[PDB]
Amino acid sequence: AMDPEFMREFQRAAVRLHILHHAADNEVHGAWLTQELSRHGYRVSPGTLYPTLHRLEADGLLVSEQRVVDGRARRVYRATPAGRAALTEDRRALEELAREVLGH
Amino acid sequence: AMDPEFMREFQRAAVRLHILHHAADNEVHGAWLTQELSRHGYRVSPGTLYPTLHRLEADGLLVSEQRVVDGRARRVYRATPAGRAALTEDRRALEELAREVLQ
Numbered sequence: 001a002m003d004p005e006f007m008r009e010f011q012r013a014a015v016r017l018h019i020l021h022h023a024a025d026n027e028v029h030g031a032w033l034t035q036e037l038s039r040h041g042y043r044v045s046p047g048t049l050y051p052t053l054h055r056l057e058a059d060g061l062l063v064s065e066q067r068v069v070d071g072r073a074r075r076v077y078r079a080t081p082a083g084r085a086a087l088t089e090d091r092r093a094l095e096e097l098a099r100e101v102l103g104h
Numbered sequence: 105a106m107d108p109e110f111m112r113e114f115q116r117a118a119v120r121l122h123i124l125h126h127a128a129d130n131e132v133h134g135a136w137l138t139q140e141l142s143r144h145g146y147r148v149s150p151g152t153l154y155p156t157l158h159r160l161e162a163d164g165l166l167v168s169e170q171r172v173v174d175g176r177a178r179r180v181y182r183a184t185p186a187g188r189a190a191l192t193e194d195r196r197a198l199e200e201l202a203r204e205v206l207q
Contacts, residue, residue: 003165003190006120007197013114014201016107021205040204061107086106091205093111097118098202100144101195104129 015042016052020087023062024079053077061086119146119156121198124191127166128183157181165190
């Protein structure tokens with residue numbers, strides 16, 4: 001990376017957006033989210049990811065639920081209404097920057 | 105803002121990218137960059153912006169030049185070769201995220 005600071009800042013924003021994107025389509029376990037973000041080209045650790053998850057929930061954008069399924073307790077995450085609205089707004093911001101910088 | 109944390113993180117990235125975008129086109133003063141980023145919808149002060157400018161120069165992505173013009177000393181910034189390469193990479197990353205996140 002010629003600009004590691006940019007990549008770092010930008011990756012934090014992109015991860016956040018992908019989490020909402022995925023949690024709007026699906027209920028998600030964190031284990032799975034790590035794999036899926038990795039598929040999308042993002043390096044993420046449990047160390048990085050769960051605190052974001054917790055913070056999104058604290059911001060009211062996600063909600064988590066302890067759920068016993070098939071004799072095993074797990075936490076699932078999903079978007080709240082506010083989270084869907086946030087996703088739209090966050091996307092809008094990305095669209096604007098895309099329009100500006102990809103065309104004095 | 106439904107997602108202030110996102111906006112905050114994202115604005116840091118967007119400001120950085122705009123600085124390079126503008127400094128690749130032409131030479132720029134920081135006073136002017138404040139106005140121009142403000143035109144583009146980014147809330148920035150000299151207090152916020154100049155440190156970014158200094159940091160980009162320290163990262164080798166910009167270079168500045170003291171110039172005395174019309175009886176007054178001013179600093180102009182421009183992209184270095186490494187900054188143009190960075191610009192391309194940073195744009196690429198933005199295009200990819202755009203394509204992905206726009207079901």
